[PDB]
Write a protein that binds this ligand. Sequence first.
Ligand code: GTP
Length: 681
Amino acid sequence: MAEELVLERCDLELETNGRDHHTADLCREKLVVRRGQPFWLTLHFEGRNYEASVDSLTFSVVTGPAPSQEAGTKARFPLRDAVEEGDWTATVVDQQDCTLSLQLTTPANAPIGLYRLSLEASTGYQGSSFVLGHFILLFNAWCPADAVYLDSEEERQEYVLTQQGFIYQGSAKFIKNIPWNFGQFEDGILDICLILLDVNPKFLKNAGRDCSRRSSPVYVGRVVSGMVNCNDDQGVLLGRWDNNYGDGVSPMSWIGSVDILRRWKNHGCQRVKYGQCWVFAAVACTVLRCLGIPTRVVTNYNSAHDQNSNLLIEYFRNEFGEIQGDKSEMIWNFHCWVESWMTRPDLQPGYEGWQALDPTPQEKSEGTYCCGPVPVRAIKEGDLSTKYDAPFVFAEVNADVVDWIQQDDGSVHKSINRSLIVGLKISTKSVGRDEREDITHTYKYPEGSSEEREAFTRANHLNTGMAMRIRVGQSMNMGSDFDVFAHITNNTAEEYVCRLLLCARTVSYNGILGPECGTKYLLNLNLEPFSEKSVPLCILYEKYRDCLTESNLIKVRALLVEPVINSYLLAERDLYLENPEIKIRILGEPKQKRKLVAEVSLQNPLPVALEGCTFTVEGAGLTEEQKTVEIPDPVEAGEEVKVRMDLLPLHMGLHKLVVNFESDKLKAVKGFRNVIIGPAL
Ligand SMILES: Nc1nc2c(ncn2[C@@H]2O[C@H](COP(=O)(O)OP(=O)(O)OP(=O)(O)O)[C@@H](O)[C@H]2O)c(=O)[nH]1
């Protein structure tokens, strides 16, 4: 006669399992593990240890609201000597005293999510059942059987574990790297991501089906990308582009994904006020990285966006080169999306790798929606039949622009524009370093190459001796007066008298032109034979301050007209006005669970004073909460603003401290500092 087995306590070995499963930061009060990999379990009994002869143990796991084995959401498996032939297995590793050391294995295609683990202990016809605990199962980039497997440890670290990174903005001529705190492993973020999955429309429709289809990185990526902005009602972010963000946080102000997700969850999942394309991409990247899908934020300069996948874009301009069309959509200065790493069994073989996910809703036949995961290689090959919006992503980097100047007869003359090529300087943060990696080659083959022609035919694409370009003498700062030049080259014997029209206007990052901040018109301009000419245009801070966006972008337009042959030359350039540098000083010795002081300062570059000055500091591993300091007194024209923020780093290793500066006339100024936290000792 055998006494019933009595479970004192079940230990889920958070420390060891977190270290093995690369989820150590995630393992706070719950257990977090990655699928396709075994994890330790320890059972403590009072009185007697488990008897293989007299005791029978079966484990059960459930994840959905409607768990099913068929759907893959529920599994029951028995204790065994060696690993058995089954997706879910439990095997004895060691037995000592009253403790049983087990290893539990999950299939590499198990659906991700929160699971309840139950044990049915049957002893001599008397059956009892316990709930051992809960655990969250995530995608495993380390597991070769997993669809998201990455062979390189460096890439796994960068695309899954690294909580800070860069978003590339500015201009193609002047690329800017904005620090961002993804903070995927910050407190509560994993639960918020699970809520984001649980409140998505497909879950509302079926729930059991949605939880079952969470086994797929494609499905989860699509759901998350839609949830960021596209989903009405339960969307994470609300997008605004008119430069009026007073009632919310301006899109440029954000320094991390964490605050956005926290505001969204804390307010009953109402859309957090004001984000733009890079904000959508950054939040999506945070969610995917938290879920274990390797993801990176990507920036494309001169992006042909919201053109309904049109590969030939035509603009009709007046005598000054101004684009007349009220219908037409401008070429974005830059557009951001994400790339996620996965196999694609739903497609023909050979399309595993980076998949482009654009969480910014785009106009399409059948409505406005984000563009689902499409293999980047398919876009490169021109294989637009490939599933999930290959035509839109392809148009993004390969569209052609034709510029027309309208005649007095009502006819249009095609101008020569060599300044503009769409799909420029596609950039992403490099692996394990702060340098920028150019990934344009992944999207497109070299121009005028055999492969390019090959791809264009598969994509059914295949579309006076004077030159002009816009020149910047040197870097120009926000708040100052500077000159730009129209540089004309006449490499011909002819002498020309031409028309030069120069217009400088403030512009948003998505191409919305504001009023002109500088103009010069020269009706009779002599261009000597075999010579060059520089015509200056003066841009004044007073002229651009009122309508300048937080992107600090100004567009320069030059139209050169040669009347005799009636030839039109067009040159356009986007200028980025440099913000003042934020000086960061780290005071004390950076050690875990020890006080650290960050001194942040900047010098006012404006001729006028600054009011409402605020410093905001954020950083996963450096501070648990965002920190804000307001400077009560105004900062006059030449003075410096300096404040000290107290930080309590809770994690060892390298972390990036992200800083934002806000003021009435100087907004969204960014700074960052790499801080390595040593052992507490
Ligand atoms: N702040 C700022 N600096 C820039 C910008 N464009 C270029 N610069 C910097 O100013 C200098 C100008 O370099 P380029 O613009 O590439 O060259 P350019 O003066 O236009 O003349 P070309 O080389 O003939 O085209 C370099 O030091 C650039 O880093 C811009 O938009 N903003």
